[PDB]
Amino acid sequence: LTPVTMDVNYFKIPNNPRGRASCMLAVDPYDTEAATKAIYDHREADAQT
Amino acid sequence: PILSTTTLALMETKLKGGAGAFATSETHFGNYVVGEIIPLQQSMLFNS
Amino acid sequence: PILSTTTLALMETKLKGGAGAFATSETHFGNYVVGEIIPLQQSMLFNS
Amino acid sequence: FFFPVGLYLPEDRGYTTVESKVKLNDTVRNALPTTAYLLNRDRAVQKID
Amino acid sequence: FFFPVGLYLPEDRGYTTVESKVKLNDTVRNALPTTAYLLNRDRAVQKID
C-alpha cells in the first residue's frame, strides 16, 4: 500500500520497491550501525533519491 | 520496471508502434505509460 | 551550461527524443530548456 | 518486477506529450485512473483493478 | 557548470516553438517557473526548489 501522491518517476527506473535504498555494497563492510542507519533512519537522506 | 499503462489507448499506441516503442514512457494529463527497462517482452522472448 | 528545464514536460520530450536532442535549447511561453554544450551526459558517459 | 496502480498525478502541473497521438473523451473515469493494463507471457493484454 | 532557476521571461514578447509537442494545464503555477529539473549521474531526473 502506497500513498496516492507517490512520485511516478520512481517507477520509471529500477528501484527498491520499499521506497528507500538498501543496497549494502554502498555501506562500509561489517559496519552494522551505519548499515541500519542507512536502511531505517528517516532523519538521514535516502541514497540515490 | 515492467510495461504498464493506466489507459487502454496508450497500450494500443504502444502495440501499433515500431521497434523500441516499449522502452519509452510518456504521460497524458492524468494517464501515463511506464516503459520496460530491457527489451524483454518486445523482442527477446519472441524473436528466438 | 548543463541540461536543465523548468517543467517536466520538456524533460520528458528530451528523454523521448533521438540522438542530439539534449543539445537543443527551446522555450515554451514561460518555460524553457537550456541545452548541453558538450554531448557529455547523452552519449559520452554511457557509450562505453 | 514492480509497477504502480491507482496513482494521482498533480493537476497543478499537469501536462501532455501525446496530444497529437491520442484523445480521450471527457470523463472523470478517464481523468482518474484506477486500473492498470499489462501483457501476459504472451503479448496479450491483461487488466488489474 | 552553471544553471538558472526561477527566471521570469519577458511576457510582453512571449513565444513558443514547441506548441505542437507539449501542452500544459492553465495554472499560474505552470506559468511561473519555480523549480529546476536536472539529470543525475545516471540519466535520471532530479529536482531543486
Curated annotation (Swiss-Prot), chains B, C:
Subcellular location field: Virion; Host nucleus
Subunit field text: Homomultimer. Makes the hexons and eleven out of twelve pentons. Interacts with triplex proteins 1/TRX1 and 2/TRX2; adjacent capsomers are linked together in groups of three by triplexes, heterotrimeric complexes composed of one molecule of TRX1 and two molecules of TRX2. Interacts with scaffold protein; this interaction allows efficient MCP transport to the host nucleus. Interacts with capsid vertex component 2/CVC2. Interacts with the small capsomere-interacting protein/SCP.
Protein family (similarity comment): Belongs to the herpesviridae major capsid protein family.
Summary of the function given for this chain in its UniProt record: Self-assembles to form an icosahedral capsid with a T=16 symmetry, about 200 nm in diameter, and consisting of 150 hexons and 12 pentons (total of 162 capsomers). Hexons form the edges and faces of the capsid and are each composed of six MCP molecules. In contrast, one penton is found at each of the 12 vertices. Eleven of the pentons are MCP pentamers, while the last vertex is occupied by the portal complex.
Protein name, per record: Major capsid protein
Organism encoding this protein: Human cytomegalovirus (strain AD169) (HHV-5)
Residues of the full protein shown: 1323 to 1370 of 1370
UniProtKB/Swiss-Prot annotation, chains D, E:
Function: Self-assembles to form an icosahedral capsid with a T=16 symmetry, about 200 nm in diameter, and consisting of 150 hexons and 12 pentons (total of 162 capsomers). Hexons form the edges and faces of the capsid and are each composed of six MCP molecules. In contrast, one penton is found at each of the 12 vertices. Eleven of the pentons are MCP pentamers, while the last vertex is occupied by the portal complex.
Protein name: Major capsid protein
Cellular compartments annotated: Virion; Host nucleus
Organism for this UniProt entry: Human cytomegalovirus (strain AD169) (HHV-5)
Subunit structure: Homomultimer. Makes the hexons and eleven out of twelve pentons. Interacts with triplex proteins 1/TRX1 and 2/TRX2; adjacent capsomers are linked together in groups of three by triplexes, heterotrimeric complexes composed of one molecule of TRX1 and two molecules of TRX2. Interacts with scaffold protein; this interaction allows efficient MCP transport to the host nucleus. Interacts with capsid vertex component 2/CVC2. Interacts with the small capsomere-interacting protein/SCP.
Family as reported in the entry's similarity comment: Belongs to the herpesviridae major capsid protein family.
Portion of the parent chain present: 393 to 441 of 1370
